[PDB]
Write a protein that binds this ligand. Structure first.
Ligand SMILES: CCCCCCCCCCCCCCCCCC(=O)OC[C@H](COP(=O)([O-])OCC(O)COP(=O)([O-])OC[C@@H](COC(=O)CCCCCCCCCCCCCCCCC)OC(=O)CCCCCCCCCCCCCCCCC)OC(=O)CCCCCCCCCCCCCCCCC
Ligand SMILES: CCCCCCCCCCCCCCCCCC(=O)OC[C@H](COP(=O)([O-])OCC(O)COP(=O)([O-])OC[C@@H](COC(=O)CCCCCCCCCCCCCCCCC)OC(=O)CCCCCCCCCCCCCCCCC)OC(=O)CCCCCCCCCCCCCCCCC
Ligand SMILES: CCCCCCCCCCCCCCCCCC(=O)OC[C@H](COP(=O)([O-])OCC[N+](C)(C)C)OC(=O)CCCCCCCCCCCCCCCCC
Ligand SMILES: CCCCCCCCCCCCCCCCCC(=O)OC[C@H](COP(=O)([O-])OCC[N+](C)(C)C)OC(=O)CCCCCCCCCCCCCCCCC
Ligand code: FES
Lengths: 231, 62, 149, 53, 61, 230, 297, 149, 89, 154, 40, 102, 66
């Protein structure tokens, strides 16, 4: 029975936690008896990937995840998704799903609200070739494929961006609003600007591809310098 | 009073309870009946809930 | 909300135009000038500005049925000590008016000398008309052992 | 400032007390004109001490 | 041995906080020559400080 | 040379020679977050990841059951033109959105600050007020209690109703259980030291100190209320 | 004899036998518990230091800086001159383009510098100030420039010396900010001309931050033993009394601290002469006793 | 059979085996064992020392090490010399307490309070009218801690 | 109960007067216990509030006995009567 | 600044040893040392009860001192003297010996009140250069001393 | 306030998606953005 | 000596001036030894004089009760509250002692 | 039949409206599954203590009052 399986999982998890507690306490007591100060040292407890019980982040090994970033709870990354330095995907209350070839800029924060009205997902879903600038904030928003969001942009709950939409930097998308496909929107309250051209679309595609390549180079260099754990 | 119609029988009711205004968060309207005698969420019998996304990603990673 | 005269699209008012100035003669004979706001007690303003000479053993008194309510509830216990006394100048003392019986009880029970203009900062509520009010703050007594801590 | 608690240093010098506290004229005089008194200035404190006596 | 999957089983940081009188002559085992030298110096100093007290106590005992 | 090492030397809590931060019970400070200087945190207050709180230039007071958000920078000013104390004061149930910056200000209880806000020194936000995400509160500006403001510079929109105030308070109370869920993932004993390699300095100290007192004196009886405790 | 010998024997036996045994057992138990808890748990890690990251031959040159926050990110071609400060969480991705930071240039917390072009460089002058949560893309910022909190400088911007950008200001792309001018708003526009008092306070604020960077660097750059000593000192001060504090000050001044030394107290408290006044103290314009200025009273 | 031999090193464990929970006997109640010397002086009590008293002293010495270390664990701001001196003082105190217990045991054996190896010719046997513990002790571990005629 | 057993109606009356007055004397503080917010009364050690597990455990044992003293009071009464019976009064 | 935890633990240890002596105690019920002390079951039980309660309170005090140290070693030395000498009162067989024992215990309590901590290192930085008068110390000493005098003479 | 989940799985909520339609062309520089969910 | 209701104000002052730990130890010593021996004076030690003690105890109890009934509601200090709790319990135990010696 | 990750699938052929609707439906279904799993874990956390400690509590109460 599923309930029995869950109960067994909880029991074994608690036993493991108690075993860890006693082991660490014994090590500390041994240090105290041995006049060893190793235990006392204060070192950052930050964990890049933190799993809530039953909510473990999942990502393809091809993805580049900045060691400065932090993935928490139910997070799902695509094939070559790149997460910038210092960006946090809390995804603890609900899940966060990302596409194959998206780029998340540095200092981007993604966190979803507790609940929303009927028919509105309470999880962040991002397209395949999305490019999100540094300093952006996202909450329970849906973004389709081939979407570029400018730096320092705020996207609130229930907001849907269709394929090809572009949002200028330093603009906010009010909660529960639609950004149609192939249009440019700017301003703190987003206002229609114009329809995108093929040249601009190609430039955005090239920009996101360049960001993916830069992420690959960063991953290689960090692995070389031992700053990246070989998962 | 004439306009008042919390349910959607006479005046259509959005699934999204309200229309959010700019400079405000999107919050559900307070229901007319606020009874808290609610069960935990109910699901169909033999409901499939396996973490298919995680399983597929783990299988691909190998 | 309320108690403001803003319309859609107006700019916020400056805090400088809203701060109420209180002039004080310190326990050491010097002069001080501090800022307070309407709706908060003179004791809160003085503690925020860190004015010396006030012990405030009870720290404002009870949190319900407080002396700051304009209609003072008869079931109020009043101040729980007399360690926040301040001497207020007559022009504003007369405007403040007669004392509550509990406040007068505490003031007379004060161990140090008292003046007819003495009042309790916790019992005083800041008002707009108190602008530029002059007070004096001699040293208040220490009640219990915990005051030294 | 190291070893002086909440006292903090300004551009032109370091204060003699915590940020929001009030400056003391007597302490200022003691620091600036230590041991020197041209005349026995009668401040409010001196007048009040005389009255109390 | 030296290292396991993640934990260093030989991890060790020496405690730099040690008492000043560690390795002093007096702290040596009682009855040793170093201890006797230290104790003799301490006793001479104490007697010089308190000639009368040492008399009244030790001689009386 | 100066900055060449493999292991970060970053600590969440730090002091400057007299300025020890104080944190209440059930208050979660993320390991990424930095809280340095004279900073006081109340009970059930949560500071999320990558947030900086410097009370070095002046004191910082944080109330109870408040949320600070992510990528938020709270810092103080040397002084204010009005002569008021330049410390940062935040009341209870205050929610501060991510990407926001707080200068020396006075935020009262139940105030909600949007994501990316910029509150400048001397601002006074009264009880229950709300601020749009990308708005700026200019220095020395008073936001009345229970009012909505938006834009840069911020401009009045409308009054807030008791339902809106209750919703904000409910959100502030709701953040607590998420904070506790995050908290439960850390054991009281840090195991990072077990992953380092012994060095010459570790094996043989250059200089020795006199045993005065161990900072963890009585910790065999102290409760491990906060796992992220040195 | 017997009692102390037993004490020493037990001390050695404990330290040499029980310590290692308990340590080994605890480590094995910790490993077993972690294995049991997997995959629904995470363990502590050695967080990498992302200061001075080298990418494809691009080596940061930041050794000539006063303060670099331990948790900041400096990658690629980032050159900083003497006295520059980079604070907590700042990210300088120099691989996109060269990032030059001048002498005594302050970059506050959570400030990101990223060139939007492929190889366009970011040049920042001396005595420049960039506030927290700022975002500079690619621009020429001359000396003594000021950027406020939460301010964005876009690509191609050129702001001249003594140009002020108000906090919360989004400078439009390809914008020129003349000297001694204040620009504010979003999009940022000219507001007024900097007054001498405003310039003075801006300079004082910049100097204050420069000086504070030294204290921050001193605190952050400490060894494990020094941090442990600081924790011990704070704990001891939590219980030190007035007499203990007075004794600390007395020993720092050089007073006798032993009974046999009490007989030479006068040589350390009274005999030592006082330093004569500086001759600048004889040139003061006025010598009237100080009193609070009763203007506004 | 219920008490250890008084001449053994474990003969000092008979102090914890008592017939009734009283402290002292009544003035006139016969001691459980024959009296060897009612008017015992210090010298004769010392002369009556035994392997049981030596075992009590050895127990005190063995148990004073953990107790001395437990006391010392609350020591701070102490030099090594003072710490060792404090350990010596506490250990000596525990051993002195053991000597006192041995002296008391010797005194009890002289007075017949505890098993001294002798038995009265005619036992004075009670009637166990009130019995709340016989079955409990027989079925429990406490039968060892009580002596029954 | 013992006063009634000894037939002291006046003593019972005065005991009750004192008991009720003291009861209100203790109870009135529950009014002050109400606070606008949650207080911070814990000492800070290592930048965090210091909560003592040992004192909490002792308080918990005291709380258990305070709640359920009636159940086990017979044993305590037996022990106290046993102690007092040695006194020949 | 030595923490008095070791003094408190020493007091607990010696109280436990005294409890062991009482548990193993034997003898006849009578008076000793010139009929100035009574040795009977009720008096011994009172002694044991006082010792047990003192031990428990000392245990709680040790935990509190580990929490925070605002009490000197002389404070707990006075507590040690009180704990050592106060249970001997119930062994009194005459009002004369009772008076002397209570006088000794009163001196010990006066010692405890004398060694009370006076000045604290608090967060109030406003009274550095002003005189604040607190009479609690003198009031305690005065009232304790005169109450002891009246009780003793009567 | 209420914390239950709106999106139930026991059955599909009856809805009409044609009463309200979202504008997707012909915008102005002063008009607000349309709404994403328009089911009644 | 004890500080019972007729003479209580000095006890209030002592409690005001004492630390919490001092009160913690002093209440234990007081109740467990001083007051217990005071009770045993009438119960066990000086039992033959109970023909005189009863009236004195009754008068003291009545005077103390009628004197504190109003004072216990005039205090405004935590130390005063603790001291008056001790005083009220002392009076109650004195009434119980009268009942016992009856 | 077989699991399909709609979010990671190719939706370029469909119109943007159909693409967003499919993504929303897929997100809702996955969120419902996650909700079910977490609710089951909460239920297990409820059941375990009951089974483990109900009889000890009854034993304690029975011994106390009988
Ligand atoms: C009559 C008038 C009164 C005076 C009489 C004489 C009394 C002498 C007492 C001992 C004096 C020791 C020296 C004191 C020096 C002071 C000055 C000084 O040094 O200043 C610097 C000194 C610091 O320098 P320091 O180096 O750290 O310490 C000094 C020494 O180095 C280290 O100091 P320490 O104290 O740590 O070390 C002491 C050690 C000094 O070190 C040594 O010399 C090495 C160790 C020698 C050990 C010798 C042990 C001998 C034991 C014999 C037992 C025989 C039993 C036989 C039984 C029968 C067998 C068949 O010497 C001892 O151990 C002395 C023990 C002697 C026991 C004799 C027992 C006689 C029993 C008689 C009756 C017998 C009846 C039965 C007979 C049956 C016959 C059949 O200042 C201090 O702080 C010292 C404080 C000393 C306090 C002493 C008092 C403690 C108790 C206070 C009680 C208060 C009242 C409450 C109790 C009420 C009753 C009293
Ligand atoms: C109906 C009204 C009822 C009113 C009741 C009023 C009182 C209720 C509350 C207090 C009751 C006593 C609680 C236990 C003592 C407190 C300390 C303690 O044990 O916790 C620390 C310790 C905590 O350990 P940890 O947290 O791992 O480490 C702590 C430190 O880190 C490291 O720890 P450390 O190394 O610093 O210290 C270790 C040591 C620390 O513990 C101690 O040192 C003990 C401190 C208390 C000493 C006085 C105990 C007196 C007991 C006799 C009855 C009177 C109780 C009066 C209590 C209040 C006095 C003011 O631990 C122990 O060894 C515990 C042993 C406790 C049993 C001692 C029994 C002595 C009996 C002596 C007389 C025998 C009869 C003589 C007859 C003679 C006839 C001629 O406790 C435990 O390990 C177990 C805790 C959980 C189970 C507790 C069970 C308590 C049972 C109480 C039964 C009471 C009598 C039966 C009911 C009577 C009414 C029907
Ligand atoms: C409340 C306060 C506390 C409780 C109340 C206080 C009680 C006060 C009254 C106590 C009276 C005790 C009297 C005991 C007298 C008998 C002693 C005894 O057993 O002697 C047996 C022995 C004699 O044993 P005997 O009696 O068998 O010998 C006679 C034997 N016949 C008859 C057969 C010949 O006594 C002695 O030989 C020595 C006598 C005393 C010598 C002088 C000692 C002075 C000690 C001064 C202090 C030293 C401190 C050293 C410290 C060292 C470390 C720092
Ligand atoms: C048939 C053959 C039978 C042969 C039997 C032979 C053995 C006879 C002796 C058995 C002794 C059993 C253990 C006794 C108690 C040991 C206590 C101990 O070591 O704890 C150290 C401990 C020291 O602590 P610790 O060593 O547990 O560790 C402390 C660790 N920290 C501090 C971190 C928590 O002592 C205490 O803590 C006690 C403090 C209060 C003082 C209590 C004094 C009690 C005195 C008891 C005397 C012995 C009574 C024996 C009764 C026998 C009745 C039959
Ligand atoms: S604070 Fe005590 S009366 Fe005002």
């Amino acid at each position: 029975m599923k309930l029995f399986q869950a109960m067994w999982t909880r029991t074994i998890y608690s036993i493991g936690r108690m075993v860890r507690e006693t082991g660490l306490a014994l090590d500390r007591y041994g240090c105290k008896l041995e006049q060893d100060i190793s235990c006392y040292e204060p070192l950052s407890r930050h964990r890049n990937i933190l799993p809530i019980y039953d909510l473990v982040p999942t990502f393809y090994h091809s993805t580049f995840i900045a060691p400065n970033s932090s993935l928490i709870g139910a997070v799902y990354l695509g094939q070559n998704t790149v997460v910038g330095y210092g960006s946090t995907l809390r995804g603890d209350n609900h899940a966060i799903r990302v596409g194959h070839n998206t780029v998340i800029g540095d200092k981007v924060a993604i966190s979803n609200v507790a609940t929303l009205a009927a028919g509105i997902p309470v999880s962040t879903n991002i397209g395949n070739h999305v490019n999100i600038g540094a300093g952006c904030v996202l909450q329970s928003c849906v973004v389709d494929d081939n979407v570029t969001v400018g730096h320092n942009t705020v996207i609130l709950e229930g907001s849907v961006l269709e394929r090809g939409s572009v949002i200028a930097p330093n603009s906010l998308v009010p909660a529960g609003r639609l950004i149609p496909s192939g249009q440019l929107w700017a301003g703190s309250p987003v206002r229609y600007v114009r329809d995108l051209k093929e040249e601009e679309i190609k430039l955005n595609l090239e920009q996101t591809e360049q960001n993916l390549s830069i992420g690959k180079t960063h991953k290689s260099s960090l692995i070389q310098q031992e700053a990246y754990d070989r998962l | 009073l004439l306009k008042f119609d919390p349910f959607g029988f006479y005046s259509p009711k959005l699934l999204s309870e309200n229309r959010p205004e700019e400079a405000m968060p999107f919050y559900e309207d307070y229901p007319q009946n606020d009874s808290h005698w609610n069960l935990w969420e109910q699901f169909p019998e033999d409901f499939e809930d396996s973490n298919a996304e995680r399983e597929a990603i783990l299988k691909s990673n190998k | 909300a309320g108690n403001h005269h803003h319309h859609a699209g107006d700019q916020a008012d400056r805090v400088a135009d809203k701060i109420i100035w209180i002039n004080i003669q310190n326990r050491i004979g010097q002069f001080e000038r501090i800022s307070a706001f309407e709706g908060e007690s003179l004791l809160e303003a003085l503690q925020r500005n860190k004015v010396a000479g006030i012990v405030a053993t009870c720290e404002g008194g009870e949190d319900i049925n407080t002396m700051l309510e304009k209609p003072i509830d008869p079931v109020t216990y009043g101040p729980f000590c007399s360690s926040c006394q301040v001497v207020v100048s007559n022009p504003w003392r007369n405007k403040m008016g007669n004392l509550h019986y509990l406040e007068e009880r505490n003031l007379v029970r004060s161990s140090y000398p008292t003046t007819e203009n003495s009042r309790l900062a916790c019992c005083i509520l800041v008002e707009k008309w108190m602008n530029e009010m002059i007070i004096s703050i001699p040293q208040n007594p220490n009640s219990v052992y915990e005051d030294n801590m | 400032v190291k070893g002086k608690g909440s006292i903090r240093k300004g551009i032109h010098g370091e204060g003699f007390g915590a940020p929001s506290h009030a400056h003391d004229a007597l302490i200022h005089q003691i620091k600036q004109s230590k041991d020197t008194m041209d005349y026995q200035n009668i401040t409010n404190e001196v007048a009040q001490n005389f009255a109390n006596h | 041995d030296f290292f396991v999957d993640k934990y260093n089983f030989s991890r060790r940081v020496v405690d730099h906080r040690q008492p000043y009188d560690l390795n002093f002559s007096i702290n040596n085992p009682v009855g040793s020559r170093v201890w006797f030298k230290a104790w003799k110096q301490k006793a001479i100093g104490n007697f010089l400080n308190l000639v009368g007290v040492h008399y009244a106590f030790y001689g009386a005992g | 040379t100066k900055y060449g090492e493999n292991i970060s030397k970053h600590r969440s809590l730090m002091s400057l020679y007299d300025l020890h931060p104080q944190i209440g019970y059930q208050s979660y400070i993320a390991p990424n977050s930095t809280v340095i200087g004279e900073v006081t945190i109340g009970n059930e207050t949560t500071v999320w990841y990558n947030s900086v709180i410097r009370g070095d230039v002046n004191a910082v007071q944080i109330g109870n059951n408040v949320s600070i958000g992510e990528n938020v920078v709270i810092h103080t000013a040397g002084s204010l033109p009005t002569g008021q104390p330049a410390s940062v004061d935040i009341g209870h149930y205050v929610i501060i959105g991510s990407k926001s910056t707080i200068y020396s200000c006075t935020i009262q209880d139940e105030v909600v600050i949007g994501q990316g806000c910029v509150i400048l020194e001397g601002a006074r936000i009264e009880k229950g007020a709300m601020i749009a995400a990308n708005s700026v509160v200019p220095p020395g500006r008073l936001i009345p209690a229970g009012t909505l403001w938006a834009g840069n510079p911020c401009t009045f929109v409308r009054n807030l109703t008791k339902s809106e105030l209750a919703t904000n308070i409910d959100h502030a109370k709701k953040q607590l259980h998420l904070a506790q869920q995050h908290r439960y993932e850390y054991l009281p004993y840090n195991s990072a030291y077990l992953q380092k390699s012994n060095s010459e300095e570790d094996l043989n100290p250059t200089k020795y100190d006199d045993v005065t007192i161990n900072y963890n004196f009585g910790d065999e009886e102290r409760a491990q209320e906060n796992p992220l405790k040195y | 004899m017997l009692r102390l010998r037993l004490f020493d024997a037990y001390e050695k036996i404990s330290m040499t036998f029980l310590g290692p045994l308990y340590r080994r057992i605890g480590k094995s138990l910790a490993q077993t518990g972690l294995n049991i808890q997997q995959p629904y748990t995470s363990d502590d890690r050695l967080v990498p230091s992302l200061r001075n990251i080298r990418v494809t031959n691009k080596i940061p040159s930041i050794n000539d800086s006063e303060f670099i926050a331990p948790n900041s990110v400096v990658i690629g071609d980032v050159i900083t001159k003497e006295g520059s400060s980079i604070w907590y969480g700042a990210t300088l991705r120099g691989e996109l383009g060269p990032i030059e930071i001048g002498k005594q240039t302050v970059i506050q917390d959570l400030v990101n510098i990223q060139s939007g072009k492929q190889n366009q460089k970011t040049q920042i002058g001396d005595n420049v100030f960039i506030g927290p949560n700022s975002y500079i893309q690619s621009s020429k910022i001359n000396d003594n420039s000021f950027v406020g909190m939460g301010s964005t400088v876009s690509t191609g911007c050129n702001l001249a010396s003594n140009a002020v950008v108000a906090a919360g200001s989004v400078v439009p792309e390809n914008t020129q900010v003349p000297s001694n001018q204040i620009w504010a708003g979003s999009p940022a526009q000219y507001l007024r001309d900097i007054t001498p008092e405003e310039r003075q306070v801006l300079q004082e604020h910049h100097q204050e931050c420069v000086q504070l960077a030294r204290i921050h660097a001193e605190e952050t750059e400490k060894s494990f033993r020094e941090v442990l000593n600081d924790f011990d000192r704070i704990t001891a001060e939590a219980e030190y009394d007035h007499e203990s504090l007075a004794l600390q000050k007395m020993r720092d001044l050089g007073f006798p601290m032993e009974g046999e030394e009490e007989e030479y107290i006068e040589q350390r408290v009274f005999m030592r002469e006082q330093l004569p006044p500086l001759e600048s103290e004889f040139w003061k314009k006025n010598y009237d006793p100080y009193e609070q200025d009763l203007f506004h009273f | 059979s219920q008490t250890f031999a008084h001449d053994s090193f474990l003969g000092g464990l008979n102090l914890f085996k008592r017939r009734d929970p009283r402290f002292v006997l009544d003035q006139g109640e016969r001691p459980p064992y024959p009296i060897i010397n009612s008017n015992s002086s210090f010298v004769d009590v010392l002369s009556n020392f035994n392997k049981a008293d030596f075992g009590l002293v050895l127990f005190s010495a063995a148990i004073g090490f953990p107790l001395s270390r437990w006391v010392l664990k609350g020591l701070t701001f102490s030099s090594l010399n003072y710490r060792r001196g404090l350990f010596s003082s506490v250990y000596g105190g525990v051993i002195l307490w053991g000597l006192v217990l041995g002296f008391n045991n010797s005194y009890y054996r002289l007075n017949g309070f505890v098993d001294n190896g002798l038995v009265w010719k005619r036992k004075e046997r009670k009637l166990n009218k009130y019995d709340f513990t016989s079955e409990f002790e027989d079925n429990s571990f406490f039968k060892k801690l009580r002596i029954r005629d | 109960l013992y006063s009634s057993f000894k037939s002291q109606y006046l003593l019972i009356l005065f005991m009750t007067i004192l008991n009720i007055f003291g009861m209100y004397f203790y109870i009135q503080n529950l009014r002050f216990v109400v606070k606008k917010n949650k207080s911070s009364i814990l000492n800070y050690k290592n930048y965090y509030v210091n909560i003592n597990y040992s004192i909490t455990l002792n308080i918990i044992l005291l709380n258990f006995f305070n709640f359920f003293g009636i159940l086990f009071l017979s044993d305590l009464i037996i022990i106290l009567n046993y102690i007092s019976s040695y006194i020949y009064i | 600044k030595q923490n008095p935890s070791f003094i408190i633990r020493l007091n607990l240890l010696l109280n436990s040893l005294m409890v062991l002596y009482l548990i193993t105690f034997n003898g006849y019920s009578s008076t000793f040392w010139w009929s100035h002390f009574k040795l009977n079951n009720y008096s011994l039980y009172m002694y044991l009860l006082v010792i047990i309660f003192n031990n428990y309170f000392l245990y709680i005090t040790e935990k509190h001192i580990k929490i925070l140290n605002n009490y000197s070693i002389d404070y707990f030395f006075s507590i040690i003297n009180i704990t050592l000498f106060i249970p001997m009162i119930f062994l009194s067989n005459t009002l004369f010996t009772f008076f002397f024992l209570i006088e000794l215990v009163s001196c010990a309590i006066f010692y405890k009140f004398i060694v009370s901590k006076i000045s604290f290192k608090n967060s109030n930085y406003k009274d550095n250069y002003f005189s604040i008068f607190s009479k609690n110390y003198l009031n305690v000493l005065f009232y304790q001393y005169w109450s002891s005098f009246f009780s003793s003479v009567m | 306030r209420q914390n239950f989940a709106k999106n139930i799985t026991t059955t599909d909520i009856p809805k009409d998606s044609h009463h309200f339609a979202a504008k997707r062309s012909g915008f102005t520089q002063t008009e607000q953005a349309p709404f994403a969910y328009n089911d009644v | 000596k004890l500080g019972i209701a007729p003479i209580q104000l000095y006890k209030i002052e002592i409690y005001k001036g004492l630390p919490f730990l001092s009160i913690f130890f002093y209440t234990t010593f007081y109740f467990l030894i001083f007051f217990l021996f005071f009770s045993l004076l009438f119960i066990y030690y000086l039992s033959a004089l109970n023909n005189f003690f009863w009236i004195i105890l009754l008068i003291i109890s009545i005077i103390g009760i009628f004197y504190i009934i109003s004072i216990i509601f005039d205090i405004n200090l935590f130390k005063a509250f603790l001291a008056y709790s001790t005083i009220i319990n002392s009076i109650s135990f004195i009434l119980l002692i009268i009942a016992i010696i009856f | 039949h077989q699991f399909e990750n709609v979010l990671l699938s190719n939706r370029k052929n469909l119109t943007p409206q159909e693409s967003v609707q499919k993504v929303i439906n897929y997100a809702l279904l996955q969120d419902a599954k996650q909700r079910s799993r977490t609710l089951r874990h909460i239920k297990a956390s409820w059941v375990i203590p009951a089974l483990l400690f109900t009889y000890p509590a009854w034993y304690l109460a029975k011994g106390a009052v009988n």
